[PDB]
Symmetry: C4
Subunit: 52 residues, 4 copies
């Protein structure tokens, strides 16, 4: 088992949870903002083309 | 409440503070640059729509 | 090395792998979304120019 | 001895370097891709206006 290895495992696990949570938040934000940009560009270009 | 467990807590706490700091900076950067791009896109589309 | 040095190396190694993986995924996502926006914009400008 | 304190400090120090390096790479990439998109958009609007 080892106290030392269990402690190491615990540190790696807890920080992995933190890193993952922040990673997912950033991933979701990038996805959200890039989606918004595609939508705005698509709307605007369709407006330009409809306006001649 | 061992010296080993207090030490583990300290390591996790200290690196969480740093991770959070960088996360918040990246979040703010993404948000500011995306807002800025939306503004530039709409300003430019307005200029094109005004030129017929 | 000593038990404690090896344990510290193991903790740093294991979290570096985690950090590097999340980093790579974020880098790939940003590159993908920005690449796609450039592709969309390039196509749209060609379409606008061809419509006069 | 003080080796457990020192080793914890060493772990925090080493991972701080890793975290900060990945943070800086992402910061720089987002900033670069944003700047590129802004340049493209500005060039394209000029090209379009120069046509009608």
């Amino acid at each position: 088992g080892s106290i030392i290895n269990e402690t190491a495992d615990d540190i790696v696990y807890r920080l992995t949870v933190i890193i993952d949570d922040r990673y997912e938040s950033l991933k979701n934000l990038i996805t959200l903002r890039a989606d918004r940009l595609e939508m705005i560009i698509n709307d605007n270009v369709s407006t330009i083309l409809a306006s001649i």
